[PDB]
Amino acid sequence: RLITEAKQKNQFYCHVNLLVIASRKFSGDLSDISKHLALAITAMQQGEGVCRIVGVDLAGFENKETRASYYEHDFKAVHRCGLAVTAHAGENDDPEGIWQAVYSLHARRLGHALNLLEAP
Amino acid sequence: SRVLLCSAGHSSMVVPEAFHAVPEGFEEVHVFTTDSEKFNPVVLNDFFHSLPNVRFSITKCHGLADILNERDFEFYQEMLWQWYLTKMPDNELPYVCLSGGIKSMSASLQKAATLFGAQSVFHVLADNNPRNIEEMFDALQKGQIHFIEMGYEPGWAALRRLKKILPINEGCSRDNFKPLISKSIEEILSNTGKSNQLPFPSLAILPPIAQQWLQLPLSANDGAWIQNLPKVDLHCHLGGFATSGSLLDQVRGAASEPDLIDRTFSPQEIAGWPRSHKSISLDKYMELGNANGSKLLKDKGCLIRQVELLYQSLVNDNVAYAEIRCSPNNYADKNKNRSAWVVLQDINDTFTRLITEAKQKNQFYCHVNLLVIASRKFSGDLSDISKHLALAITAMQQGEGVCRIVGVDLAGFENKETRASYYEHDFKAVHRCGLAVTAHAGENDDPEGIWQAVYSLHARRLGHALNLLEAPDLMRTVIERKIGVEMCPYANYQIKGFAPMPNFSALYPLKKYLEAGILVSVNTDNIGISGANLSENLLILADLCPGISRMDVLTIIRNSIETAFISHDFRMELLKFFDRKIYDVCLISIKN
Amino acid sequence: RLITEAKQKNQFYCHVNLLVIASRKFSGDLSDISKHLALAITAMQQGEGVCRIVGVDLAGFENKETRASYYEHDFKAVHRCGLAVTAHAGENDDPEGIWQAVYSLHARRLGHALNLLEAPDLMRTVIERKIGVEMCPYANYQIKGFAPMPNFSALYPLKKYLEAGILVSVNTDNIGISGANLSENLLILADLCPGISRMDVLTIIRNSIETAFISHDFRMELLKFFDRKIYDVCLISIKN
RNA sequence: AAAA
Ligand SMILES: Nc1ncnc2c1ncn2[C@@H]1O[C@H](COP(=O)(O)OP(=O)(O)OP(=O)(O)O)[C@@H](O)[C@H]1O
Ligand SMILES: Nc1ncnc2c1ncn2[C@@H]1O[C@H](COP(=O)(O)OP(=O)(O)OP(=O)(O)O)[C@@H](O)[C@H]1O
Ligand SMILES: Nc1ncnc2c1ncn2[C@@H]1O[C@H](COP(=O)(O)OP(=O)(O)OP(=O)(O)O)[C@@H](O)[C@H]1O
Numbered sequence: 006r007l008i009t010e011a012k013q014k015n016q017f018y019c020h021v022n023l024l025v026i027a028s029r030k031f032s033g034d035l036s037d038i039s040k041h042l043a044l045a046i047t048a049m050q051q052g053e054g055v056c057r058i059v060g061v062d063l064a065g066f067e068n069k070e071t072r073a074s075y076y077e078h079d080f081k082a083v084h085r086c087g088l089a090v091t092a093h094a095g096e097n098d099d100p101e102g103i104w105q106a107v108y109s110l111h112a113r114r115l116g117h118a119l120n121l122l123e124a125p
Numbered sequence: 126s127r128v129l130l131c132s133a134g135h136s137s138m139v140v141p142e143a144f145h146a147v148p149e150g151f152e153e154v155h156v157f158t159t160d161s162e163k164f165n166p167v168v169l170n171d172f173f174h175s176l177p178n179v180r181f182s183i184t185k186c187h188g189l190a191d192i193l194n195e196r197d198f199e200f201y202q203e204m205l206w207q208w209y210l211t212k213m214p215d216n217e218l219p220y221v222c223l224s225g226g227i228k229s230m231s232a233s234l235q236k237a238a239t240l241f242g243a244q245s246v247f248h249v250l251a252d253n254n255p256r257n258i259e260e261m262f263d264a265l266q267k268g269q270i271h272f273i274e275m276g277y278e279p280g281w282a283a284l285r286r287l288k289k290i291l292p293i294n295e296g297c298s299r300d301n302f303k304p305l306i307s308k309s310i311e312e313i314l315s316n317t318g319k320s321n322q323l324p325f326p327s328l329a330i331l332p333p334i335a336q337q338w339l340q341l342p343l344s345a346n347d348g349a350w351i352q353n354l355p356k357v358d359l360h361c362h363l364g365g366f367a368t369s370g371s372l373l374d375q376v377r378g379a380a381s382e383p384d385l386i387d388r389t390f391s392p393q394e395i396a397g398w399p400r401s402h403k404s405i406s407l408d409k410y411m412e413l414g415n416a417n418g419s420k421l422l423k424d425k426g427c428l429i430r431q432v433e434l435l436y437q438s439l440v441n442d443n444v445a446y447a448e449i450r451c452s453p454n455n456y457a458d459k460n461k462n463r464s465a466w467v468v469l470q471d472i473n474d475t476f477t478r479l480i481t482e483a484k485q486k487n488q489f490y491c492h493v494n495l496l497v498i499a500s501r502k503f504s505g506d507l508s509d510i511s512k513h514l515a516l517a518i519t520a521m522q523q524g525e526g527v528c529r530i531v532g533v534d535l536a537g538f539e540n541k542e543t544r545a546s547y548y549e550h551d552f553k554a555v556h557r558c559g560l561a562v563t564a565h566a567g568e569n570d571d572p573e574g575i576w577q578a579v580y581s582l583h584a585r586r587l588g589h590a591l592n593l594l595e596a597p598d599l600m601r602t603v604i605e606r607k608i609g610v611e612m613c614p615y616a617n618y619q620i621k622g623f624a625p626m627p628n629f630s631a632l633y634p635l636k637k638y639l640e641a642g643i644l645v646s647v648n649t650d651n652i653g654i655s656g657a658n659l660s661e662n663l664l665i666l667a668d669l670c671p672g673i674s675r676m677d678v679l680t681i682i683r684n685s686i687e688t689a690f691i692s693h694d695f696r697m698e699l700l701k702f703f704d705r706k707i708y709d710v711c712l713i714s715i716k717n
Numbered sequence: 718r719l720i721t722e723a724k725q726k727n728q729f730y731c732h733v734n735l736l737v738i739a740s741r742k743f744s745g746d747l748s749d750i751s752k753h754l755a756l757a758i759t760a761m762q763q764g765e766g767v768c769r770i771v772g773v774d775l776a777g778f779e780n781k782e783t784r785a786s787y788y789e790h791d792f793k794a795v796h797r798c799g800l801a802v803t804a805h806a807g808e809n810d811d812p813e814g815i816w817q818a819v820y821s822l823h824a825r826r827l828g829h830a831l832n833l834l835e836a837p838d839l840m841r842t843v844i845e846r847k848i849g850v851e852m853c854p855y856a857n858y859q860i861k862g863f864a865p866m867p868n869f870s871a872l873y874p875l876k877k878y879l880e881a882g883i884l885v886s887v888n889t890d891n892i893g894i895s896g897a898n899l900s901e902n903l904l905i906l907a908d909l910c911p912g913i914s915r916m917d918v919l920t921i922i923r924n925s926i927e928t929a930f931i932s933h934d935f936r937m938e939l940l941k942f943f944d945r946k947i948y949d950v951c952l953i954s955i956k957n
Numbered sequence: 958a959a960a961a
């Protein structure tokens with residue numbers, strides 16, 4: 006509605022797309038990842054709209070507890086439907102974890118990841 | 126009401142002392158007696174017309190005297206039962222006394238009182254055996270005459286529809302007999318776990334005669350009892366309901382945009398439907414329903430009309446719970462901004478609005494839950510099954526509402542490529558979220574396919590699966606894991622062919638499944654395509670599985686309740702309601 | 718022999734079945750689990766006898782090192798043969814481990830698992846799949862500690878489990894170590910889980926029958942006899 | 958076959 010009403014009066018408007026965060030909790034109810042992935046998959050099917058869901062975010066603690074090497078099975082369907090994958094790598098991003106996120110999770114965008122220079 | 130019935134023999138003075146039983150007198154009195162001339166109606170008449178408000182009548186059985194023969198006794202019993210049924214008050218049980226006469230007709234009257242109900246069975250006795258009217262007059266004035274009451278009797282609540290279906294029979298002879306009670310009594314036990322398989326514990330409080338009428342084999346004449354029963358349907362496709370006929374016509378008429386619909390196409394008809402004499406292939410069966418479905422339910426109006434008509438058919442069949450299978454993607458299109466999600470939401474909203482409207486008016490309503498069908502390799506890329514799974518998962522999270530999505534449905538084409546052993550990674554999420562899984566594995570699938578469905582997909586129900594006998598280990602693992610199986614007698618009979626299918630020897634294994642303990646259920650698959658609702662689907666078991674009993678029908682209903690994808694609290698509430706309703710109908714359906 | 722000689726004189730007898738514990742030692746000889754599984758599978762083939770092997774138990778310390786995320790390859794065969802699996806998830810049973818036991822290990826009945834209250838999804842799965850939980854009142858009360866034991870405010874979850882719909886069975890674990898038989902284990906619930914009723918005890922017995930590893934015909938016969946005996950004892954108690 |  007905001008984008009459409011800004012376009013109606015012909016002024017500057019910020020096109021906005023949405024990313025559904027698949028947060029890691031590990032304090033129980035780990036089905037939150039599945040719920041978020043399914044919600045994003047069926048939300049992208051809206052079709053119309055200037056604003057639309059374009060992908061998912063791999064937020065949560067980036068520790069070894071919930072890295073990207075465990076959930077390729079979940080994300081095969083996400084890649085099948087056409088949703089891009091973004092991985093948070095702000096803290097304790099071991100090079101092997103980032104490599105797994107790139108190659109097993111097929112992430113097309115890495116969050117932060119300021120320690121890439123250590124692994125050529 | 127407040128009626129006496131009594132048996133008059135040599136001494137007719139039993140009728141007045143029976144009349145004086147209560148401390149306020151009665152309203153009507155009728156006495157049945159044999160044809161012997163020893164009994165004097167004049168004594169009863171002179172005692173009785175002094176009270177004109179009391180209607181008195183005498184019935185005599187022609188051709189019977191002293192009842193010294195077995196044929197005499199059977200004729201007297203038949204006549205006395207008919208007379209009791211004719212003089213049965215409409216709403217209230219009558220009073221009856223059996224002090225007079227020999228043991229034969231007294232025991233006959235007691236048995237009749239047990240069979241057709243009696244407000245109070247009592248006995249009258251006196252020390253001096255009064256003969257003249259002043260004799261028992263003085264006896265009752267002093268108090269010598271005592272009233273003997275061995276206890277109230279409720280009788281069997283409904284056995285009076287025999288009066289409706291049998292005529293008055295004023296002119297009778299030695300030919301028109303009804304051995305309908307003797308046959309039940311003989312077949313009580315003339316034939317292990319059948320006695321302990323008692324479902325709906327209130328069935329125990331049923332009359333013993335009713336309890337063993339339930340033990341008698343099911344017959345095609347039990348249609349009214351089957352229809353009046355509250356039933357459960359777990360395999361009912363939404364699309365294959367209004368396939369052809371008037372329902373299809375009105376569904377087409379209620380379209381929002383009638384121009385785009387194709388009213389020209391009609392499905393080919395098989396002679397003898399629904400009791401087809403030739404096997405039909407699965408693709409031909411699906412094509413039989415091409416009139417309705419994806420090519421017609423695209424518009425909102427047709428879908429809403431189909432949902433409303435399906436709910437009306439369900440509630441008109443006395444189905445108290447149903448699990449409708451739907452494929453929202455098949456009725457979705459981006460042309461008018463109609464995704465699968467909004468189609469599913471339309472179905473859910475229509476169902477919940479109908480249920481709430483029917484419940485507010487305090488009418489019988491069918492709680493309906495939805496299953497999202499996840500076809501595999503249907504429209505090209507395999508992303509369709511993942512999209513269906515995600516849609517079902519997201520549809521669960523609605524939470525508030527009467528109708529809710531409870532599980533998903535699967536279908537594998539032939540073997541190998543789509544059986545059960547490839548998508549565990551997909552189904553890990555569907556199991557985490559809480560959805561249930563049902564498999565359509567009935568396409569002559571290998572026992573390994575059923576095994577993978579049971580273990581790899583953790584399916585809680587199996588579609589059809591009529592070939593479990595060849596794999597005893599499969600039967601053992603299905604029974605042990607309490608995995609219910611859903612079979613549609615009409616669809617399975619038409620597609621596969623079961624006796625009395627012409628040129629076919631295979632028998633329906635539903636009876637053997639019930640004996641082995643499988644949580645079997647009876648469903649409809651597609652109502653429109655098969656042309657048979659749940660009632661006749663249950664009724665056809667009298668021919669598909671000869672020797673099945675009414676207890677087996679109630680056990681099938683109980684298994685349908687147990688295997689339904691519902692929460693424990695809701696399951697307990699549904700079980701309580703089903704038990705009460707089943708007791709109510711079984712009390713008032715053995716009448717015929 | 719004991720059961721047959723009890724039946725011959727026509728007295729009360731206790732039909733017993735055996736569970737082969739798939740124990741863990743980890744001080745060497747890791748093939749012990751495989752040997753136990755094979756022994757149970759072969760012993761099931763005996764066929765005859767009133768007492769027969771009906772399943773296996775995943776006993777031993779349940780630390781994360783030996784959770785149910787590995788031995789699926791072992792237990793595929795045991796599921797194929799027809800042996801039920803019981804998981805001894807007493808201590809340190811994280812929800813992920815119990816979930817793996819339910820789905821990866823296909824456990825038909827769990828041991829203890831008193832911490833299902835905190836996990837709602839796990840409870841819903843356990844209720845829906847109709848898998849029993851074996852909680853021993855005296856053993857859990859002594860080890861874990863619940864009310865009315867001093868300095869312990871944790872409440873026993875048996876009443877909540879029964880209310881939710883869990884197929885809960887009351888057991889003994891060890892008659893000697895705990896010092897209480899099954900009757901005392903059922904009796905202690907009067908104060909361990911206040912507000913529990915006698916009909917709830919009958920429900921517990923029914924759940925124990927339903928979750929037992931027995932064939933359908935034997936289960937029906939057992940249920941018939943149990944209904945008979947329960948009716949008799951209830952009538953006797955109410956008439957005296 | 959102790960209101961035939
Ligand atoms: N915030 C924005 N403001 C203006 N135009 C945008 C903006 N974001 C994207 N555009 C693009 O500019 C065009 C919007 O205006 P329009 O489609 O009428 O063409 P235009 O007027 O020639 O371009 P412009 O608006 O830059 O002058 C679109 O091509 C649109 O993709
Ligand atoms: N016996 C079956 N075997 C395989 N697939 C089936 C069967 N019955 C139904 N289906 C599935 O249902 C759909 C076929 O019907 P359709 O697509 O037209 O809509 P429907 O609501 O499922 O049923 P219908 O339209 O016939 O009333 C397909 O997705 C199909 O996979
Ligand atoms: N189609 C139905 N018709 C009538 N009652 C149903 C139906 N389906 C379920 N029930 C049960 O009836 C009750 C619905 O009404 P409600 O939940 O308010 O309780 P209730 O009114 O006391 O019971 P009842 O409606 O049988 O008199 C529930 O117990 C429900 O399980």
Ligand SMILES: Nc1ncnc2c1ncn2[C@@H]1O[C@H](COP(=O)(O)OP(=O)(O)OP(=O)(O)O)[C@@H](O)[C@H]1O
Binds near residue numbers: 730939943945
């Ligand atoms: N699983 C069993 N099946 C049958 N009888 C059993 C079973 N277990 C114990 N019994 C014995 O049967 C009796 C329990 O049922 P019940 O009291 O009704 O006697 P019953 O039915 O005459 O014996 P049965 O069931 O062997 O024919 C007890 O004597 C009991 O020792």
Ligand SMILES: Nc1ncnc2c1ncn2[C@@H]1O[C@H](COP(=O)(O)OP(=O)(O)OP(=O)(O)O)[C@@H](O)[C@H]1O
Binds near residue numbers: 740741776777779807
């Ligand atoms: N809480 C438990 N967890 C795992 N295993 C257990 C547990 N309790 C008993 N066991 C099993 O019992 C055995 C431990 O003791 P042991 O091997 O000496 O035989 P036991 O007679 O069953 O017990 P014990 O002799 O120590 O009293 C092992 O088989 C072990 O797996």
Ligand SMILES: [Mg+2]
Binds near residue numbers: 360362565588650
């Ligand atoms: Mg079907």
Ligand SMILES: [Mg+2]
Binds near residue numbers: 805828890
């Ligand atoms: Mg133990």
